[PDB]
Amino acid sequence: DNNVVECIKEITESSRNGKLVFFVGAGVSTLSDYPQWWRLVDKYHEELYGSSDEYLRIPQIFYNVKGEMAFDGILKDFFQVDKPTNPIHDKILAMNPAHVITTAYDNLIDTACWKRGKYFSVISAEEDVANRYLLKVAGDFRKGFKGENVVLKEDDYLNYDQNYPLISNLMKTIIATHTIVFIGYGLGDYNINMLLNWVRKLQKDSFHKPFFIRTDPSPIENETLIYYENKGLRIIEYDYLERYSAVMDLLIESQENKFITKDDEVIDYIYGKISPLFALQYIRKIDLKHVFE
Amino acid sequence: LDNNVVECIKEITESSRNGKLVFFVGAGVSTLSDYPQWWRLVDKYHEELYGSPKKGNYSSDEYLRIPQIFYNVKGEMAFDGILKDFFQVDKPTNPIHDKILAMNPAHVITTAYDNLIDTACWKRGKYFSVISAEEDVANATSSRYLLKVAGDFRKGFKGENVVLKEDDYLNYDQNYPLISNLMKTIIATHTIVFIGYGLGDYNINMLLNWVRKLQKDSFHKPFFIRTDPSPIENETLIYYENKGLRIIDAASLIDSNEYDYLERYSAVMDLLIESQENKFITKDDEVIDYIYGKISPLFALQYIRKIDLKHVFEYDYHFEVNGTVVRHKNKGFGYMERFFELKESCDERSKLSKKQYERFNALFNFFEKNGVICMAKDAGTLNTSIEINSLAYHGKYDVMKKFIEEQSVSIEDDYKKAFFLACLGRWEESYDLYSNIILNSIDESNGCVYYLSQINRYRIYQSITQAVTQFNGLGLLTFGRHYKPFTDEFLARIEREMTNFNIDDLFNGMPFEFQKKYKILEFLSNQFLYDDTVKLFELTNKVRSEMSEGSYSFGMSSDIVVLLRLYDNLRFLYENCLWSVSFHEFHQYIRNSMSLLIEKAEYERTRDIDELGFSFKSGFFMEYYDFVNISRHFKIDDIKNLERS
Amino acid sequence: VIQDTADVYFKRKSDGKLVFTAEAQTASFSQYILKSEKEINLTVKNAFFDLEWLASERYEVEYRTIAYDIYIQFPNVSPSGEFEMSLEEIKFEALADTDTDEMAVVIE
Amino acid sequence: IQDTADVYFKRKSDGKLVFTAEAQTASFSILKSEKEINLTVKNAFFDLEWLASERYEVEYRTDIYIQFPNVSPSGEFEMSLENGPEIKFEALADTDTDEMAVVIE
């Protein structure tokens, strides 16, 4: 797919120019193995008795009836596990991400980033921007295992404008100012793409069509393709690790020698290489070592 | 002078050397540049509309009433005609733009229709991405942004490029959303310093109250320099503090006329330009607390060269290898001289807090540990002192085996054991220990050990790689066997682990405050000993030049400089446990230095004696340290040439 | 007259098998029963090793150039190994047998 | 018996000191004898009230005194890009009063 090739070109150039930001969803946590939220949804379904509306309303009744202490206890036993990292994190860091946006409440990506030498700044609460940015748009359990520290109900999404104004504002700033690649997005954050639709109404032609890695096991249908044309997302199931590594090997490796086969094209390639040196009047032989890597 | 203004200056200077400061410029710099003003354009609109400018009675209503009347009555083509007539002239800029840009803003946000600031940005040398329209954010190349609220005339002289009408401000929410989002992001993230207005940009002031009502005291209080020559109503100043504004009056510094505000526009900013921390430090307890806060985070090391010390103190003093101090760029208070004056008198040592007094004694122990002895004028004779505490230096191999086998508790002791394990051939095991040291020191509140472990990990990766490539080739010819002591598992693991791993990013890799406290450690960041080999080479030229004829190196002589630089570099590399002592170029450095010292000894013992030599011995004596330096870093042919010479 | 760019073939006394091929850059000759010691040293670049040979020991050196057909043979040699390491060349020395102490063969 | 010496450079039209410094390096070289001495000397401070040809004289002290009344300064041009002070002067020799070795022990 030539769309994938042009995605690789733009993302590599954005990495070399600092214009690349990777969006993280939740499936990368499954790539290094983690407890899954819908199992806790089914736990609440069994516990409360004795739809997407129900996905937060059943926790809302659970907070209203069973109380906050049951939420604290059942979040403690579900979010105290420890796991290692996956090489998908290492390939993301090999693609050198400027910022990290995610909703998954595990900081294993932070430990993987500190396995690399670079430093990111954790931004979860409101006071974090006052002091490379790790944007936890859903928060995490750094301060405590409290329900208010993260998002748990519909009313969190209702009050998200006043609860986290600066997080969403600088999130939109990063969305505008950099090329965005959406990995791990399981097509659940419909408010995010609705805000993207509003930004698409703001932007029109300057909207860059940022690329969303779908990788649903079915091939993309015609109505779905027209939908992603409406939504401006170029498109990139138990073998998600293999398919993501297969795409990102072609992304990272980025061989010029793949386009070096015929004698005619490489003449134009070298002419593109020594294009600006016609302006200067003399060069050195050792400086040619800095041309061709 | 007011001390709150002093700490405001301190806050913006630390933001400036952090690089997180952004200047907002209003419309005052157009008045300084003799640009055509807006109110006389309103007067022009008033005379064309009403058929007379009359008295005018130009008020805040008439600022936002008259061009609306111009638009609906006289159409839009006469607007373009007046805009061509009045905003076509050009003029060179002021020094004010240069001293605004001299504080190195990350981004610059403006509200003036001209383009003098962009021309000054090109004059400064750097490039800033000009963001004047909503389409400009898409092709935003540089990370340094020129943000533009009022637009400019680069898109022609149409009405859509400009924004002056009130309904444009009404539609401004949908007209420039992303510009507003950029503005809110910059004022949230960076410290913003306000200039160029007369407290009348009330829509922007309501935006300031909007971020105030959205962030409270977590929002940093922005700074504005009041350029009105009258005395400031202090109740309104406190009200602006209640609004969350830190205003500094120009008239508080100096006041004359009203048109001299341009000079005032220089003067306070001139006070910003030469603003030095040691300028305001006027008492001795402030001196010892300042040098504690400037030095005492460097307690974690073992040995540091004296020539590195000039990186700490902004090259205000020269710290030479003998241990003396020379004033070089220190233009404020003589705080190092006052420090040694405090060291002179025990009575002055009593006139201090005893916490500060034991801090003074701890820093005294540090300076005697690094051998800093007085200024050049204060000191007289000096002694060459040699001390190495390294176990690997003296070759206590079995003692190193026992210490490796001993109990490992401290991560600093773990780093020392990893250096021993690298020095005792357990290279993959030492790499594993380095990786576990990094994993333990993920959040251990000192990145110094992290920096050293990363550097040694990269060097031992390259050492293992070059060793396995030399094992692949002629080692088979030498031994009659491939004899490979390694397997590809950790080779592939370190290959993927060191993929795209540069070295110069590592100094950028640490946080901002680590850079601001440990810029002295930049030496470790691929050109090891490059400048030191340059200094060795030029001193080699000087030594052979004075060797070629009769000379009398009075007092300090270059062999002392060579010997002290050698022993200083050797002690700093060995004592802090850096693996790079194994490498070949350092051996070449030791070879050149020791050969020059030996040749100096031969020329001293063999030279003729004239009357001044009779009017004025000092033969070189070899030491056990010299025997170690001979044995570690030489090759048989070179010492055969030393026999020949 | 000699173009002074010779080429070296490095062989082994067993089978006459070629070990590698290179070109030399530095060579150093230095010093009743008259006793005189002479020493030879050779330095070549990164050679062309033979993968066929990948599938102590005595080796020999031949050293060929043109003078206008001048060939040099050293029958007994040792490639002394020097392990080094750095950031970001093969040296030989002679061997003189105790049976017939001969070192240099010249074919003109 | 010590080694470190202070140098004093003055002008013999008023006997007034021009600058003082520390010694760094000497340079030596009916028949005729050809010897020439040139001196290099490190950083110094000049005379402030001097700011308001001639002959010049140099004194060395370390008591041991080495003086000579026939010197001329040679300030060679330098061009350093790092930046962040050297004084070079040579001896002179007239005809009738050729005398350059004043010593006090």
Side-chain angles (χ1 to χ4, degrees), chain A residues 1-81 84-293, chain B residues 1-529 531-645, chain C residues 1-30 36-99 102-107, chain D residues 1-29 33-105:
Chain A
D1 185 25
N2 301 323
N3 269 320
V4 177
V5 181
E6 194 50 57
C7 281
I8 287 173
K9 292 169 180 178
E10 289 200 7
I11 285 321
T12 39
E13 190 60 44
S14 299
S15 65
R16 293 154 200 174
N17 291 5
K19 216 191 164 296
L20 164 66
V21 166
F22 280 110
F23 171 74
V24 186
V28 204
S29 304
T30 76
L31 292 183
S32 190
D33 309 327
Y34 204 74
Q36 305 303 315
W37 165 245
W38 63 85
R39 304 161 185 174
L40 193 45
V41 168
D42 302 1
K43 283 179 178 177
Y44 295 149
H45 152 259
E46 178 53 51
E47 281 152 351
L48 187 70
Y49 291 160
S51 77
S52 300
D53 181 32
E54 279 184 336
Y55 282 166
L56 308 171
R57 192 177 58 179
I58 294 178
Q60 178 55 249
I61 303 178
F62 203 84
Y63 199 89
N64 291 331
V65 176
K66 312 301 176 182
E68 43 90 11
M69 57 308 287
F71 257 114
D72 296 335
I74 210 172
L75 261 293
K76 273 160 188 174
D77 46 57
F78 214 74
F79 277 81
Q80 272 165 351
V81 305
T85 185
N86 52 55
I88 292 302
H89 299 146
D90 294 327
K91 290 153 67 57
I92 284 283
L93 286 173
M95 213 11 91
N96 193 15
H99 305 309
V100 176
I101 27 182
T102 172
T103 67
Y105 318 100
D106 43 354
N107 36 18
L108 87 172
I109 174 63
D110 317 357
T111 62
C113 286
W114 198 251
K115 280 157 187 173
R116 216 184 179 91
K118 220 145 61 72
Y119 168 77
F120 269 72
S121 302
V122 184
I123 309 298
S124 64
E126 285 284 286
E127 309 293 297
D128 314 5
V129 84
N131 301 281
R132 314 300 103 170
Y133 300 142
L134 180 95
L135 290 170
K136 288 297 297 155
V137 301
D140 42 0
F141 285 150
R142 297 187 308 152
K143 268 75 58 190
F145 278 76
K146 297 302 291 300
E148 66 268 19
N149 201 19
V150 291
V151 283
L152 239 305
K153 285 97 191 169
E154 290 115 336
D155 22 308
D156 307 318
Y157 291 93
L158 294 182
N159 304 140
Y160 179 68
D161 310 13
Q162 64 267 43
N163 288 348
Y164 313 105
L166 41 96
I167 292 181
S168 185
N169 207 356
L170 94 104
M171 186 265 306
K172 286 151 50 177
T173 314
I174 294 311
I175 278 282
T177 201
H178 292 329
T179 328
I180 315 294
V181 171
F182 310 95
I183 204 177
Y185 186 26
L187 202 114
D189 306 328
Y190 303 108
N191 37 325
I192 294 298
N193 36 92
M194 242 82 83
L195 288 170
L196 281 178
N197 205 341
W198 167 71
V199 167
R200 270 194 278 101
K201 297 148 196 170
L202 299 183
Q203 242 181 345
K204 287 87 54 190
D205 62 327
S206 303
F207 171 77
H208 299 74
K209 191 180 264 295
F211 327 110
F212 154 69
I213 306 181
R214 179 229 43 150
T215 57
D216 297 10
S218 62
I220 167 172
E221 303 185 353
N222 43 6
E223 312 110 345
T224 321
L225 181 58
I226 291 183
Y227 258 151
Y228 283 115
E229 288 161 16
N230 300 314
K231 290 149 187 163
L233 304 177
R234 274 158 69 175
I235 288 306
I236 288 97
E237 59 182 2
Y238 325 109
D239 292 329
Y240 280 160
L241 194 84
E242 178 190 4
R243 301 155 92 169
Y244 288 161
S245 301
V247 174
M248 213 161 189
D249 280 7
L250 200 69
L251 173 62
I252 288 179
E253 191 257 2
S254 76
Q255 213 185 48
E256 302 171 353
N257 199 31
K258 292 179 301 184
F259 301 99
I260 295 176
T261 48
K262 195 195 165 185
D263 303 358
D264 295 13
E265 34 156 25
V266 198
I267 291 300
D268 323 337
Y269 159 75
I270 295 178
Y271 185 78
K273 281 305 181 183
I274 331 176
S275 34
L277 293 189
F278 303 138
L280 206 51
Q281 289 191 65
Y282 198 61
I283 59 173
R284 300 181 313 180
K285 299 180 180 180
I286 49 175
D287 308 4
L288 303 179
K289 300 196 172 194
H290 303 310
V291 181
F292 307 100
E293 216 261 327
Chain B
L1 298 181
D2 205 353
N3 293 333
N4 39 75
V5 187
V6 171
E7 56 91 15
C8 284
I9 286 181
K10 288 302 183 306
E11 204 272 345
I12 59 187
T13 42
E14 63 90 17
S15 313
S16 182
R17 59 181 154 264
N18 193 20
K20 293 196 177 181
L21 90 168
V22 165
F23 288 84
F24 160 71
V25 36
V29 90
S30 301
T31 321
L32 311 189
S33 304
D34 307 336
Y35 204 69
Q37 279 77 18
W38 210 353
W39 57 269
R40 53 179 72 256
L41 181 57
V42 178
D43 298 357
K44 244 85 71 185
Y45 294 152
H46 203 54
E47 60 89 13
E48 56 83 18
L49 266 173
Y50 255 160
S52 62
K54 50 177 185 62
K55 222 272 122 180
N57 319 120
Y58 309 103
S59 63
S60 299
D61 179 34
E62 304 201 2
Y63 265 98
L64 292 155
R65 183 80 280 135
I66 305 178
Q68 291 77 356
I69 302 179
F70 192 21
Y71 184 80
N72 49 45
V73 175
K74 314 293 185 177
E76 216 264 340
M77 303 305 114
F79 244 126
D80 296 328
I82 295 194
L83 194 67
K84 283 289 190 178
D85 283 333
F86 203 49
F87 276 155
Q88 209 51 69
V89 299
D90 295 318
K91 43 208 59 180
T93 77
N94 46 40
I96 311 295
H97 291 111
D98 320 359
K99 57 215 308 300
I100 277 292
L101 290 169
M103 275 303 163
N104 193 16
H107 330 278
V108 33
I109 162 74
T110 150
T111 47
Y113 297 99
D114 60 87
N115 292 323
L116 299 180
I117 313 120
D118 176 69
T119 311
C121 175
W122 276 92
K123 287 316 125 195
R124 195 72 174 100
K126 297 192 173 186
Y127 163 71
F128 271 59
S129 291
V130 193
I131 309 299
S132 65
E134 281 279 310
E135 287 81 11
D136 317 351
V137 203
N139 311 339
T141 60
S142 178
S143 61
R144 308 184 82 93
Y145 295 109
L146 183 59
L147 201 57
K148 187 81 246 185
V149 161
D152 45 2
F153 302 139
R154 298 190 317 169
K155 273 79 58 185
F157 279 76
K158 324 168 188 177
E160 46 184 1
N161 331 321
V162 86
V163 35
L164 24 80
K165 217 173 161 298
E166 181 48 51
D167 54 349
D168 313 354
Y169 303 122
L170 162 131
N171 296 288
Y172 170 72
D173 43 359
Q174 90 255 16
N175 285 16
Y176 303 130
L178 272 313
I179 299 181
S180 66
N181 298 134
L182 282 168
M183 182 56 174
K184 289 156 191 171
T185 317
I186 289 308
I187 67 182
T189 45
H190 300 294
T191 312
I192 321 292
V193 34
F194 275 56
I195 207 44
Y197 64 97
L199 305 172
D201 46 357
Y202 285 134
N203 46 331
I204 297 106
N205 302 329
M206 284 324 112
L207 295 187
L208 287 178
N209 197 22
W210 175 85
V211 266
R212 278 305 303 177
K213 293 306 159 300
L214 262 303
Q215 214 170 313
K216 309 109 183 180
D217 295 331
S218 182
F219 199 84
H220 311 89
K221 275 78 56 184
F223 310 93
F224 165 65
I225 314 293
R226 176 185 181 267
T227 44
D228 180 66
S230 72
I232 169 66
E233 311 169 352
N234 57 331
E235 35 105 27
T236 317
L237 175 61
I238 295 176
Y239 165 65
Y240 286 152
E241 293 160 7
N242 296 132
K243 289 178 61 181
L245 271 301
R246 283 156 93 170
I247 317 296
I248 293 102
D249 192 16
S252 58
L253 281 318
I254 199 58
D255 184 25
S256 62
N257 298 273
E258 79 282 349
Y259 39 82
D260 297 336
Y261 43 23
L262 156 78
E263 283 83 351
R264 294 190 283 267
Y265 263 105
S266 72
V268 188
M269 215 193 318
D270 283 319
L271 196 58
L272 190 44
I273 283 182
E274 53 241 15
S275 58
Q276 308 173 6
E277 299 179 7
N278 38 37
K279 271 183 174 184
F280 303 97
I281 296 174
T282 56
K283 291 289 297 183
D284 302 335
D285 44 0
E286 321 167 328
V287 173
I288 186 74
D289 289 335
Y290 155 74
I291 65 171
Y292 194 76
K294 209 181 185 177
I295 296 182
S296 54
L298 273 312
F299 272 167
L301 52 103
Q302 296 300 132
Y303 201 73
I304 273 294
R305 303 162 297 175
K306 308 176 184 178
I307 60 184
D308 320 346
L309 200 58
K310 66 174 178 61
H311 291 285
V312 174
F313 300 96
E314 309 101 21
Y315 314 104
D316 303 5
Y317 301 90
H318 283 184
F319 313 97
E320 46 264 7
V321 78
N322 49 56
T324 50
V325 184
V326 180
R327 176 183 295 197
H328 180 234
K329 294 178 172 178
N330 173 253
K331 294 295 159 298
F333 187 80
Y335 51 88
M336 285 296 143
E337 300 90 325
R338 184 54 187 183
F339 166 78
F340 281 102
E341 281 161 12
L342 287 180
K343 199 186 180 186
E344 283 155 15
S345 165
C346 58
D347 314 332
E348 292 177 357
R349 274 168 268 171
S350 60
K351 294 187 292 290
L352 208 60
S353 161
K354 288 308 127 192
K355 181 252 306 175
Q356 300 174 337
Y357 175 60
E358 69 97 4
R359 142 183 307 130
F360 178 83
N361 301 136
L363 260 302
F364 146 81
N365 293 328
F366 158 73
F367 277 134
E368 297 307 309
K369 178 183 159 191
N370 267 342
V372 183
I373 304 299
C374 299
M375 270 65 68
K377 43 180 182 299
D378 295 13
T381 169
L382 287 177
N383 173 41
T384 303
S385 59
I386 297 100
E387 202 264 0
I388 304 297
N389 270 332
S390 176
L391 274 313
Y393 180 78
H394 307 276
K396 311 298 179 182
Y397 279 79
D398 303 343
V399 191
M400 274 186 294
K401 294 169 185 184
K402 301 310 163 300
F403 191 79
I404 279 166
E405 288 158 352
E406 267 151 33
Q407 173 55 238
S408 306
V409 175
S410 159
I411 201 176
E412 292 86 0
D413 297 9
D414 279 311
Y415 177 73
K416 283 184 286 296
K417 286 179 192 197
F419 172 71
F420 293 156
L421 280 165
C423 110
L424 293 197
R426 314 277 88 85
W427 285 6
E428 176 58 42
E429 295 90 338
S430 179
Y431 162 71
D432 293 328
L433 189 54
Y434 274 138
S435 316
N436 295 16
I437 276 162
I438 289 183
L439 287 181
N440 294 141
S441 57
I442 284 177
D443 291 326
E444 273 187 9
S445 310
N446 177 31
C448 289
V449 196
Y450 185 86
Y451 184 57
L452 299 189
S453 306
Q454 285 280 356
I455 290 158
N456 295 138
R457 189 168 74 177
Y458 195 23
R459 295 317 167 196
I460 205 67
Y461 159 70
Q462 293 160 318
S463 314
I464 285 172
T465 314
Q466 195 174 3
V468 77
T469 52
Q470 200 167 2
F471 269 147
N472 280 338
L474 76 152
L476 165 67
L477 311 175
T478 316
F479 284 80
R481 175 181 41 186
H482 267 296
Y483 202 17
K484 308 302 176 55
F486 304 101
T487 172
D488 61 327
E489 172 253 346
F490 44 83
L491 297 182
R493 196 213 314 173
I494 205 166
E495 197 270 349
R496 61 209 50 183
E497 121 89 354
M498 222 67 64
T499 303
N500 316 122
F501 188 85
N502 211 322
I503 178 61
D504 51 354
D505 60 333
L506 257 60
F507 215 64
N508 311 117
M510 276 96 55
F512 319 109
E513 87 293 322
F514 197 92
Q515 186 260 322
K516 202 58 68 184
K517 206 44 201 46
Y518 303 96
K519 211 258 299 175
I520 178 181
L521 275 321
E522 98 290 337
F523 157 75
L524 296 177
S525 62
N526 194 25
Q527 292 298 134
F528 280 142
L529 232 61
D531 49 339
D532 192 49
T533 37
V534 164
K535 298 309 286 186
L536 173 68
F537 172 72
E538 56 88 21
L539 284 182
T540 301
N541 299 131
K542 183 185 179 185
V543 159
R544 268 181 173 149
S545 186
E546 69 104 1
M547 190 267 302
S548 62
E549 70 278 350
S551 61
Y552 284 99
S553 55
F554 293 113
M556 176 261 307
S557 65
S558 184
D559 51 353
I560 312 178
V561 185
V562 165
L563 178 67
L564 259 304
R565 190 85 73 90
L566 202 171
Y567 273 55
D568 212 335
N569 275 107
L570 191 68
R571 191 174 174 183
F572 150 77
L573 286 181
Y574 263 149
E575 276 290 329
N576 304 282
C577 300
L578 311 180
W579 164 246
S580 298
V581 288
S582 60
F583 280 71
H584 171 261
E585 285 80 6
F586 186 60
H587 303 342
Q588 186 62 42
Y589 165 74
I590 300 300
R591 269 196 299 270
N592 280 58
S593 57
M594 191 136 296
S595 296
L596 257 302
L597 285 184
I598 287 177
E599 196 267 340
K600 159 70 64 173
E602 182 73 23
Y603 179 74
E604 183 259 0
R605 208 225 55 92
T606 46
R607 72 173 305 176
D608 295 332
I609 296 299
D610 58 325
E611 314 93 344
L612 268 308
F614 188 78
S615 311
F616 295 110
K617 214 41 194 168
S618 58
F620 162 71
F621 301 144
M622 58 97 48
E623 308 301 319
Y624 165 69
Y625 302 89
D626 312 2
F627 190 77
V628 168
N629 290 340
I630 280 170
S631 297
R632 275 222 172 98
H633 318 114
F634 270 102
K635 184 51 195 65
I636 317 181
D637 316 345
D638 296 318
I639 38 199
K640 272 197 297 299
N641 296 6
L642 289 186
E643 287 197 332
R644 287 164 191 165
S645 57
Chain C
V1 287
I2 314 107
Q3 73 275 336
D4 311 330
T5 61
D7 64 331
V8 189
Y9 320 123
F10 195 91
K11 285 195 171 293
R12 188 186 73 259
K13 60 145 301 301
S14 298
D15 197 70
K17 183 159 167 48
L18 179 71
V19 198
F20 46 89
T21 54
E23 53 99 6
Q25 300 91 46
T26 95
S28 91
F29 160 70
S30 184
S36 175
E37 68 280 349
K38 324 251 75 180
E39 55 271 30
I40 321 291
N41 306 271
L42 293 94
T43 296
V44 305
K45 57 116 191 179
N46 279 343
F48 305 96
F49 299 144
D50 300 15
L51 197 58
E52 325 296 323
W53 175 233
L54 189 132
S56 66
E57 190 50 53
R58 183 174 180 268
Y59 315 98
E60 62 267 16
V61 178
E62 54 266 25
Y63 184 87
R64 326 293 215 187
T65 160
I66 304 298
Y68 270 137
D69 304 355
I70 163 161
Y71 286 2
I72 322 292
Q73 208 282 146
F74 302 147
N76 192 9
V77 85
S78 175
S80 65
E82 292 83 22
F83 183 87
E84 279 81 19
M85 39 91 68
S86 169
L87 307 112
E88 52 79 30
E89 182 262 318
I90 298 108
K91 168 86 175 53
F92 317 102
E93 76 283 354
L95 285 183
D97 57 307
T98 176
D99 169 74
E102 178 266 310
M103 199 63 250
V105 190
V106 164
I107 305 298
Chain D
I1 311 300
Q2 278 68 242
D3 183 73
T4 63
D6 284 323
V7 303
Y8 277 51
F9 179 84
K10 29 179 194 305
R11 201 262 319 265
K12 47 164 78 65
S13 183
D14 43 358
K16 205 254 213 166
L17 262 304
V18 185
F19 44 86
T20 60
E22 63 282 348
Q24 168 61 38
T25 289
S27 182
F28 279 96
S29 170
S33 183
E34 303 94 14
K35 47 180 63 61
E36 171 61 41
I37 169 78
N38 321 297
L39 307 179
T40 98
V41 34
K42 296 183 300 303
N43 186 25
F45 70 103
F46 80 114
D47 181 277
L48 279 317
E49 70 273 5
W50 194 265
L51 304 173
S53 295
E54 292 86 0
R55 198 70 66 169
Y56 314 94
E57 66 276 14
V58 174
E59 178 168 6
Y60 273 64
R61 40 171 51 90
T62 163
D63 204 304
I64 307 298
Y65 284 80
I66 317 294
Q67 294 96 334
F68 15 88
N70 315 115
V71 292
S72 182
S74 66
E76 274 73 35
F77 177 70
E78 74 277 355
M79 194 59 179
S80 164
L81 83 146
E82 183 256 333
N83 305 124
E86 194 267 352
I87 293 100
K88 176 74 197 53
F89 64 96
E90 298 83 356
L92 306 177
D94 65 310
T95 77
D96 47 357
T97 60
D98 177 86
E99 187 188 57
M100 57 293 302
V102 177
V103 281
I104 288 97
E105 100 209 338

